[PDB]
Structure formats: structure tokens, C-alpha cells
Amino acid sequence: AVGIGAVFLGFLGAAGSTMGAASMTLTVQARNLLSGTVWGIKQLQARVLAVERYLRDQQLLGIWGCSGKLICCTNVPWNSSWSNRNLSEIWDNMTWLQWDKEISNYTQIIYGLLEESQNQQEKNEQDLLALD
């Protein structure tokens, strides 16, 4: 879902667009997330906070299936007790600012399941290599 258009398509440009349309511009927010006598200390701790946050997010990705995919799929199924709404009414109706609030309570339940499924898939892969 990308077409020909000459406008800049910049950082947080599609924050209000629906989340089926902001997904076609995710490398922009990924790009503009890292590079940007006493005050050098303040600037320096701001820069190390930036690189620490980037490393924490890349570590959360890396212990899951995707390390540099930027769109990755996994093997845990969507529990319908979490959001109990249709597939057609998320990708064409709501935004990420509005979808963030609706699963913020069910966040950190999902991440443990992601790590659990990735550890189980790693040990299944190790056993499948080991039986050969």
C-alpha cells in the first residue's frame, strides 16, 4: 500500500493515520530515533540516555524472533480476551495512539509469552538439529 507522491513523508507524519497506513512508513520513525563548561555533562547524559533506550528496544527485539526485520511474525496466538474486536476494525479504523491505550493493561502479559515462545522455539530447533 505505497504509491507515487512527492511530499516529504517525515517523522511522526502518519501518527494520526490509521494503523494499516502508518505501517507503510515505519523506517522513518526508526531512522529518526537515534541520531537526533558544565552543559557538556547534560548533553552527554542525554546522548547516553538515547543510546541506552535504543539498546533496550533492540534487546527486546533480539530475544524474540526478529532482530532486524522491523516487521516480524511469531507463534503465539492473539488471545481474544485481550481486545475482543474484529480484524477489520483495527487496520482501517484506529491509530497507534488509540490502540496503545486499549492494550496497555494487557501489555507485559504479551511480552512474557513472546519470550516463552521464542525460548521454546530455540530449544525445539536445537533438538531438531541434535536428532540429525
List residues near a copy of itself by CB under 8 A. Answer: 1-2, 24, 27, 30-31, 34-35, 40-41, 44-45, 47-48, 51-52, 54-56, 59, 61-63, 66-71, 73, 115, 119-120, 122-123, 125-126, 129
Binding partner at 41 among a copy of itself, another protein, ligand NAG, none, C-beta below 5 to 8 Å by kind: a copy of itself
Query: How many other CB atoms are found less than 10 A from the CB of residue 8?
Result: 8
Binding partner at 7 among ligand NAG, another protein, a copy of itself, none, C-beta below 5 to 8 Å by kind: another protein
Q: How far is CA 59 from CA 52, 62, 86, 122, in A?
A: 10, 5, 31, 16
Which residue, judged by CB position, is nearest to ligand NAG in the bound state? 105
User: How far is Cα 113 from Cα 107, in angstroms, rounded to an integer?
Assistant: 11
User: How far is Cα 89 from Cα 53, in angstroms, rounded to an integer?
Assistant: 32
Site for another protein in 85-104 (CB under 8 A): 87, 90-91, 95-97, 99-100, 103
Pick between residue 43 and residue 84 the one whose CB is nearest to ligand NAG: 84
Among 52, 102, 116, 125, binds ligand NAG (CB under 6 A): 102
The alpha carbon torsion through 74, 63, 66, 21 (nearest 10 deg) reads 80
Give 66's contacts (C-beta < 8 A, 6+ positions apart): 72
Query: How many other CB atoms are found less than 10 A from the CB of residue 128?
Result: 9
Among 37, 43, 105, 126, binds ligand NAG (CB under 6 A): 105
Residues that bind ligand NAG (CB under 6 A): 102, 105
